[PDB]
């Protein structure tokens, strides 16, 4: 009936029907600006006098049952959105800054909104060798990327496929964000000492068959959850490293021997998320021959090529791009690899073995998914390196 | 209660009575499923009410002597069960999950369901070859295999046919699982710091002649067991490889000197388990012969060649098969392979030697008893990727 | 304090005890060179060396062994070491500093005096894990 509750209650509204994930509401010196994030970037949405601060800003605690009065510090909390025919879990922060509280509203997905694996983005030949190394019956495979480059939903994609009820899955997450029926899951509890090491040693006695680690981010986690695929079972955990090999890497430094991570390690998917062109502004457009010799395509693959990039129409506000696409770089452990993680290699000389054994850097695949015009160059170099 | 306690009385009985290994007690978003692991599979047994799931778990933390004021950590206990001819020990698991806590209850084996070696399992050839092994004055005998393929049958099997009232056997066990007769046995105790490597080494101390280690899952353990077998102790010890040569491999790379290897020891076993076909649904199936090329079948067994199938009846609960068996793969050391391991030569080329000296591989082995009949062809290559 | 260490320690000795090969069953056994060479011998003392081990007999039980026989160890300190106290250099790198002056170790005196037949190559091994 107000007007803050009003606006609110549109803003969420065009956020749920443009796939939004994030809402900012951000004081400022004379305004209030509103950006909504939309494939990873924000764009502005709107903006209200300073006035309209402490309505909206209310209005955000109390759905999320958050202190009013308390405006000296942040406060976080959770509300079930449900207005006309939305229904969305919302994650709510406040924040004090020099203008006034910011507030942040993330809309959270749900079970219905994990993709099979068929839908995940893979490359032809690249998910042959993806569904190989799902399919085995015990080792680690470490999913690995920065945040919000879509591990949570590869991770379980892969468990509605193998996840089978002649097995027992358990998860150790923080916090859990899925309903996944079929699956037992467990929230790592700070307050009660459930940490992730300490549900994982548990996990050993609870027979299980499939077990999923949300977060190896100490050495313990990284030990135990290496020790479980070493004694026989399928464990599908996530890192966060700039590559494939240095997960393998990374796990040395955290402290596993080497010779148990040559024995357990079955891969190591690192992925990121591209814009998707917009279809509606969709172009041709034509590249520079050089430049694409320049980023490393042979010429036969110059010679079919044509690029797109979009203009910009209202279905995309501007940008040229609407929704996301993975990108994806898959390390296969085979022998070659073991006896170089067994002999200390480096990182880097572990990425010349997996490209010669035939693993697609992730700047590969990004420019073999810009030639089906699925996105732009653009993105390919923003989201890529050498 | 009463009927919590009325439930927990019939799925521990039909568990023991089905061979169940594992009770699963999950609480779901509107139900509380439980079911059993038989041969190593989960079947559904029944669904609760989700009302019902705190009395249940009441029923079976007492049972364990657990705290029923705790559901926010995990707990584990065990449970001594006695009701009519029923007697069964259950290791117990409690676990906190989004909908309440799990139980899991774990039926555990006795000295009298172990084997003797000639029930292992071996095929013709390959056992004559074991109880050469195992017959062997001093040296390290490997047992490797992931978990559940029956390393601890195996190996008190062993000790029970060579733990004679003329020898110290010791062990080192996490948990210790058979109160075996006859025979020491010493429990990891990690909150006292008695680890496998500190028991090992007081071992030393122990007068011992044969020492069993449950498990070698560091470098220190490693090198105490090597130490022991050159001191000229008999060791049975249990490692995580996917083939018996790569056993060998393992030891190097956990920091034992290949000479030390090579001095120490006397035999690796890798083993797994393959369900079992059906015999009440059994079919004959006629084989892929592209299949069996690929297997290194010879044109003339690729003739003669059989393979079977449970269709799935009552009897077998629709899965096709009842009961497991063991496949095998012994590497037995001798000269060339002693010297194959000093001049330093890599689990592939170790094996290609032991196999030319007659060592049939895991494949082979489980193929052998495809033939016969005795599980599928389909478990034999999922149990060896 | 490492310079009182430094300034007083002359040597420091480092020994095991090996079982000793019986001698009235004491046999020999043709070595693998491959053994001897990682075990850090010349190709020149390989040509010669043989080994030997006790087949067991009254005289000793069926052990193959009697009595006992002793491997040493001798870190002699010089300046180097001396310096390498101060320093802080670690075992590990004093161990490889007292070898490269010339200090034979426990598993080199072992098959040293295994080459001669006092003890099996398998007591030398046992002793000398580190
Ligand atoms: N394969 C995909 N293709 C297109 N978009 C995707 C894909 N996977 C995920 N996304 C989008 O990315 C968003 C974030 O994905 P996800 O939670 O899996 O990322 P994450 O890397 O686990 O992030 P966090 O850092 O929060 O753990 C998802 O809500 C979805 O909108
Ligand atoms: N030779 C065999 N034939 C048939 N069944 C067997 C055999 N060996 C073991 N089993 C069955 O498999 C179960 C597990 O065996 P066992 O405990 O020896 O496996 P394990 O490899 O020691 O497991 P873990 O890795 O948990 O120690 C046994 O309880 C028994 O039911
Ligand atoms: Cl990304
Ligand atoms: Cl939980
Ligand atoms: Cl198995
Ligand atoms: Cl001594
Ligand atoms: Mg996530
Ligand atoms: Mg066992
Ligand atoms: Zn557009
Ligand atoms: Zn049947
Ligand atoms: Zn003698």
């Given at each position: 009936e107000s007007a803050a509750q009003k606006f609110v209650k549109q803003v969420i509204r065009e956020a749920f029907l443009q796939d939004a994930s994030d809402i900012h509401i951000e004081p400022r010196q004379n305004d209030v600006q509103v950006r909504l994030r939309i494939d990873g970037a924000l764009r502005p949405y709107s903006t209200l006098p300073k006035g309209a601060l402490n309505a909206v800003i209310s209005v955000v605690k109390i759905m999320g049952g958050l202190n009013i009065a308390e405006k000296r510090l942040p406060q976080d909390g959770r509300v079930r959105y449900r207005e006309g025919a939305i229904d969305v879990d919302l994650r709510l922060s406040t924040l004090p800054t020099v203008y006034g509280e910011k507030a942040v509203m993330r809309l959270l997905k749900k079970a219905s909104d994990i993709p099979e694996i068929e839908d995940l983005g893979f490359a032809p030949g690249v998910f042959e060798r993806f569904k190989e190394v799902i399919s085995k019956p015990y080792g680690?495979?470490?999913?690995?990327?920065?945040?919000?480059?879509?591990?949570?939903?590869?991770?379980?994609?892969?468990?509605?496929?193998?996840?089978?009820?002649?097995?027992?899955?358990?998860?150790?997450?923080?916090?859990?964000?899925?309903?996944?029926?079929?699956?037992?899951?467990?929230?790592?509890?700070?307050?009660?000492?459930?940490?992730?090491?300490?549900?994982?040693?548990?996990?050993?006695?609870?027979?299980?068959?499939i077990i999923m680690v949300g977060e190896i981010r100490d050495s313990e986690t990284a030990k135990i959850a290496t020790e479980a695929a070493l004694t026989g079972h399928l464990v599908i955990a996530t890192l966060h490293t700039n590559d494939a090999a240095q997960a393998i890497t990374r796990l040395d430094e955290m402290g596993v021997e080497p010779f148990n991570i040559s024995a357990a390690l079955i891969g190591v998917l690192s992925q990121r998320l591209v814009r998707r062109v917009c279809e509606h502004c969709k172009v041709e457009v034509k590249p520079d021959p050089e430049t694409l010799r320049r980023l490393g395509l042979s010429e036969a693959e110059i010679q079919g090529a044509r690029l797109y990039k979009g203009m910009g129409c209202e279905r995309c506000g501007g940008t040229g791009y609407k929704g996301r696409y993975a990108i994806h770089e898959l390390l296969v452990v085979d022998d070659e690899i073991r006896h170089a993680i067994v002999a200390g290699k480096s990182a880097t000389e572990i990425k010349e073995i997996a490209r010669r054994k035939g693993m697609k850097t992730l700047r590969e695949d990004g420019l073999y998914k810009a030639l089906q015009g699925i996105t732009t160059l653009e993105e390919v170099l923003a989201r890529t390196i050498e």
């Open positions: 680690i495979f470490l999913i690995t990327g920065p945040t919000g480059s879509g591990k949570s939903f590869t991770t379980f994609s892969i468990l509605k496929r193998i996840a089978t009820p002649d097995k027992n899955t358990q998860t150790i997450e923080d916090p859990v964000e899925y309903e996944i029926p079929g699956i037992n899951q467990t929230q790592v509890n700070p307050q009660a000492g459930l940490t992730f090491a300490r549900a994982l040693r548990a996990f050993l006695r609870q027979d299980p068959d």
